[PDB]
Write an enzyme that holds these catalytic residues in place. Sequence first.
Site: not given
Ligand SMILES: [NH3+]OCc1ccc(-c2cccc(C(F)(F)P(=O)(O)O)c2)cc1
Length: 282
Positions: A216, A170
């Site tokens: 995804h 991540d």
């Molecule tokens: N709450 O602020 C915005 C926000 C909230 C959650 C996330 C986020 C949560 C889990 C994983 C990811 C991630 F790792 F960026 P992915 O590569 O799975 O899209 C991003 C990214 C941005």
Amino acid sequence: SPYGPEARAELSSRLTTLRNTLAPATNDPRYLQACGGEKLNRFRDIQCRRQTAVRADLNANYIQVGNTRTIACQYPLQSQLESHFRMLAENRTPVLAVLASSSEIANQRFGMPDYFRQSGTYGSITVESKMTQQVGLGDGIMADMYTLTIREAGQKTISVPVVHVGNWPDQTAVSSEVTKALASLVDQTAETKRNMYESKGSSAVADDSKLRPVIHCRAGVGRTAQLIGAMCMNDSRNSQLSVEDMVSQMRVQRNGIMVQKDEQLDVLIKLAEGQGRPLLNS
Ligand SMILES: [NH3+]OCc1ccc(-c2cccc(C(F)(F)P(=O)(O)O)c2)cc1
């Protein structure tokens, strides 16, 4: 330099403005809304552009970057798995690319069901998972492949090739080399499956809402966006499409977070530079 710190600063300025203006308001008419108590969005701040939504009960978007047509989504919630599999089957999905890590999936605190490595039953749909080949992408990054055979009484049985990158953490960017290898594997896998449908005379071949690769990760905004960007650059139809265009298309068609880290944007820049592709629109 067209790829120097000035150009990069300008690119970031434009993209940040766009991110900030696309942030979802409560009841935002731009974004798909939950109905009736059931959770739609895995993360409150990661929402699904209404105009391009695939199903009313999924956080999933049709995305076209230049000429490259895909579906980007969140990791489906447990309650969404039947609808997710229906989307997969209906789309005659030629490749499902999962970029969420094995560690993420196994952590039950994250509620990421293990839906493609195990067989299961989801309402009226039964799913059979078989492991196929394993492909190294470089730098220790591994793709495990599967087939998902989706059955439902009175429906045509549909099998979906899966490419699972299980060790892309991540909020990181795998290298430009790994990304290019991954894009090639995903496009090659799609191409093989698409060719089978074409050889059988499928009517999905004439329908631009269908035969889209589905990508995804966990949220569907970081790792997903890096892969989609790379795929778009691997498509010969996309000559002259700038990085500004590519990122601005993903953001308007899903949400403003698409390309979540600076290091992910930097891999797109480096791939662009390699091709002599512009960063900015003139
Ligand atoms: N709450 O602020 C915005 C926000 C909230 C959650 C996330 C986020 C949560 C889990 C994983 C990811 C991630 F790792 F960026 P992915 O590569 O799975 O899209 C991003 C990214 C941005």
